[PDB]
Design a binder for this molecule. Sequence first.
Ligand SMILES: *[C@@H]1O[C@H](CO)[C@@H](O)[C@H](O)[C@H]1NC(C)=O
Ligand SMILES: *[C@@H]1O[C@H](CO)[C@@H](O)[C@H](O)[C@H]1NC(C)=O
Ligand SMILES: *[C@@H]1O[C@H](CO)[C@@H](O)[C@H](O)[C@H]1NC(C)=O
Lengths: 502, 44
Amino acid sequence: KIQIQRSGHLNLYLLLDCSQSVSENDFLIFKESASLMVDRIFSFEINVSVAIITFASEPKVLMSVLNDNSRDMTEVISSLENANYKDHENGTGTNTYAALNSVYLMMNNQMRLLGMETMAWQEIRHAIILLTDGKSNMGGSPKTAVDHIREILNINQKRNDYLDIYAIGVGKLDVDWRELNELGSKKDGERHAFILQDTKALHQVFEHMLDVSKLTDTICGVGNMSANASDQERTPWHVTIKPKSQETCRGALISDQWVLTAAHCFRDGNDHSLWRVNVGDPKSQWGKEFLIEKAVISPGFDVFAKKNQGILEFYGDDIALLKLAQKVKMSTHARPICLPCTMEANLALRRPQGSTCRDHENELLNKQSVPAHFVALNGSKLNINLKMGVEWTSCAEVVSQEKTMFPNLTDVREVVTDQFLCSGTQEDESPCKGEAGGAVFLERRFRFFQVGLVSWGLYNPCLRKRAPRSKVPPPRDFHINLFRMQPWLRQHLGDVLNFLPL
Amino acid sequence: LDALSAYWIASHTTEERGLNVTLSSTGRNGFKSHALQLNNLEEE
Ligand SMILES: *[C@@H]1O[C@H](CO)[C@@H](O)[C@H](O)[C@H]1NC(C)=O
Ligand SMILES: *[C@@H]1O[C@H](CO)[C@@H](O)[C@H](O)[C@H]1NC(C)=O
Ligand SMILES: *[C@@H]1O[C@H](CO)[C@@H](O)[C@H](O)[C@H]1NC(C)=O
């Protein structure tokens, strides 16, 4: 399997079959799969050099790892889309041996450039992926070239991890299963030959094609993109907080020792020594229990602040801060989620250095209805839509229909200020009190960003079991906006995260 | 009495008895080294 790690350098050599037996639309499917393939690797931000070659009767090196642009995402994707199905018009046969030999000539030139005994050639682990039907018919048996590339890298039991070869047929192709087995020789129990119909099945199999356990540099937003994986792996930042009140609230990891939650979940007081927080751990599904060094509550938070106006509960500044007893051991089940308007989020967004907080908010909240997610009690991921601007007023107009929490309400903005987001419209799920304090996060560039936290809502479905209703008041949820709380978050997290300028 | 005391401490005294060795070679794959403490058994 491909070892995703910080140590060493990765080469991916993607070979594209352009034979006439493969139709033009199938080649387009290959290019789409290749696009997702190259996007996934570069999301881990490791040293990877990518070269693409197309072959029908002769190999065409559209990109070489010897060029420094092989480490650049934009140049690689541009060259990927530069590929044309008619580039092999003169020769329409199937010549896999020529492609493998081109890979060999490449490797020989690279080791000449860097050095035989130099570590720049030693550290590198090489992976080659074939997207072809496998029905080779001339040029010679590719297995001899497969053996040929082995001695140039000295492949034996002690260097098994340095070479990875895969032959997968994707699309509406008459795939020869026997041919893919020899090229994609099995190592240990891991398969190297697969037959798949579409790019999505290849997405899943390629999620199982990566060993991301090797590195621990633990950038945010690296969840898991497989339905096969556990819920905690999908949202590693999701943590569990139980105060003395015996109620369960949720939280999100943002660093190795910092936890974000809602202020309303600590009603007994500020005795943070009595609270316990559970974080996901690979060793057990119950997680690992930690103590809290210190707690910071929002000083502007007060549930009965507006009781003089008939407002029983006001969720203004419903945000709480916690310092864990010890640093959290980063793993697949325990990874932070980066706040916007931060340099870490800027790298996660692959954005230029000169970014501002308003620009990050624009990039995230770029649509009238922005889909979002929150974690339920069972760890499941649900989908909600964020409404801003003109529709933001529309989502909040339904609070005046309430009969219990606000017996005396006349002004809508007095309870739902600019700090509250919009969710619960149409078929959107409504988080309940047990899930309060959880992360409202967005997916972009295979990265997760927490834009808000669950504070309160107009409906309580939990009152594993969920059930909606169609009676006034309609379901509606409000999340504390993290973009509106930047000053205080920078006051307490300035030494933890390098916040970008406002 | 001082003589017997000094002689007896000289007779009964124990050292570390360490036999640390290092193995190194230049394989085609690079250079490697190892260390084997033997202060107190046998190691492989
Ligand atoms: C890649 O290697 C370079 C040295 O060429 C180093 O600066 C960098 O931190 C490494 N890791 C990456 C890009 O993840
Ligand atoms: C995930 O689980 C499903 C259901 O068992 C199974 O069909 C599938 O092969 C698994 N793996 C992938 C990569 O989808
Ligand atoms: C994601 O799940 C895949 C399943 O193949 C596994 O290989 C990988 O290590 C997991 N990664 C994380 C970060 O959970």
